Assembly symmetry: D2
Homo-oligomer: 115 residues x 4
C-alpha cells in the first residue's frame, strides 16, 4: 500500500540506494518512526508496510537526498525531500510517492489508486 | 526499447489515454513519423518499436498534452510536450521517457538502461 | 535581502498569491525554532524575511501552507504543506531564492543562488 | 514586454546564463517562422523579445539550446534542445513568462501569466 520511487535527473537513471524514512503523526503531535528502507537498483522501495498497519493518519515520507548525493561525492543543497500527507482517510488506498532529484532541486508527485 | 509513462499532477493518478507520436529525423532533416500509440490505464505506453527498428538517430517524442486536457474538459496552456534526443549512438539502450502533467506546466525525464 | 521565497501555481499558470510561508532555523537540540514568516504577494514573492546579520549559517526549513492555498481556490490537495529544508553556507553565493511550483498532487522546488 | 523567458539550472542552483533561445510563430502552412531570439542574461532572463503590437494570437514555439549550455559546462546532456509550444490567447492575461528548469536528463517548464 505504500511504494516510493526515486529517479536521478543528472544520470538519467533510477536513484539507487536512497534511504527513506516514513513517520506518522502521533496523538501527541510528535513524529513517530513508522517504516524505513532503501531504494533498489530500479529506484523502487517496496515492503515498507502492510494494509493492516497502514492506518489513517498524517504521514511524512522523508527521502534522504543529501545522503544520496554525498555518497556520490556531490555536495547538494537540500537536507532531504519531504512529502507530508493524510492517508487512508476515505478508506484504504495504494500510494506511490515518486521523486526526481537534482543537486539543487527536486520534484515529487503522488500516484494513488483504489484497490 | 522505448517506453513512455505519463502522470497527472492534478488527479494524483496515471495520465490515461494520452496520445503519443514519435518522429525520427530523416537524412533530409525533416521529421518522419516513426511510431505512435496511447497510454494505458497505468499511464504506460509499450510496444512502440523493436530493437531492430529503433536504430541510431534523433528522435522526437511528442506527448499530446492539449488533447489530453481538452478530453477532460480543461483548457491547458501547451500544445504538446516534446522530448528530442539522440538515441542508440553508443549502441542499443532502453529508454523510458516519463512526463508529469499540469494544465500550465509539465516535467519530463529520461530513464536509460543498458541491456 | 539574503532570502526570498517565490511560489508559482501550475494549475492556473500564475503566481501563487497570499500563500502563508514560515521559516524555521534548526536549534542545537534539533528542534525547529521560528525564524521569519509572511504571505506571498501578488507576484508570488515574499521579500523582507531576514537581514544579512540575522541569516547565519545553519539548517533552515521553509514551510509553505499549500493546503490552505488550494482549499481557498476550492481544490482538494494531497499534501499537508510543502517543506524545503536546506543548509545556508557562507562559502557559496550570497542571495538565496527558494522557488516552489505547486500542483494539487505534486510540487517542485529549486534554489537560485546568486551574488 | 508581453513575452519573457527565464531559464534556471537545477545542477548548480543558479540562473542558466548565456543560453540561446529562439522563438518561432506557426505560419498558415504549419511551418515555424522565426519570430525573435537572444541569449539569457546573468539573471537567466531574456527580455525585449517582442512588443505588444507584434505579439498576436497564435501558436508559438520557444526553443532553448540546452545542449550547448551543458556542453559549455563540460556536461554531456540528453536532449537536443528544450521546446515549449503554446497558444497566445488575448482573452487571458497580458504578460507571459515562460520559465524552464534544466537538468542534464530532465527539464520542467511552466507559464506565469499576469496582468
Ligand atoms: O518508470 C516508471 O515506472 C516510473 C514510475 C514513476 C515515475 N515518476 C516519474 C516522475 C516523477 C516526477 Cl516527480 C517527475 C517526473 Cl518528470 C517523472 O517518472 C516515473 C517513472
Amino acid at each position: 500500500p505504500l511504494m516510493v520511487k526515486v529517479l536521478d535527473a543528472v544520470r538519467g537513471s533510477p536513484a539507487i540506494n536512497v534511504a527513506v524514512h516514513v513517520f506518522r503523526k502521533a496523538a501527541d503531535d510528535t513524529w513517530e518512526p513508522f517504516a524505513s528502507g532503501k531504494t533498489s537498483e530500479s529506484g523502487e522501495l517496496h515492503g515498507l508496510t502492510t494494509e493492516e498497519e497502514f492506518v489513517e493518519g498524517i504521514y511524512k515520507v522523508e527521502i534522504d537526498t543529501k545522503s544520496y548525493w554525498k555518497a556520490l561525492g556531490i555536495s547538494p543543497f537540500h537536507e532531504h525531500a519531504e512529502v507530508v500527507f493524510t492517508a487512508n482517510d476515505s478508506g484504504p488506498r495504494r500510494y506511490t510517492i515518486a521523486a526526481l532529484l537534482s543537486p539543487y532541486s527536486y520534484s515529487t508527485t503522488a500516484v494513488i489508486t483504489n484497490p
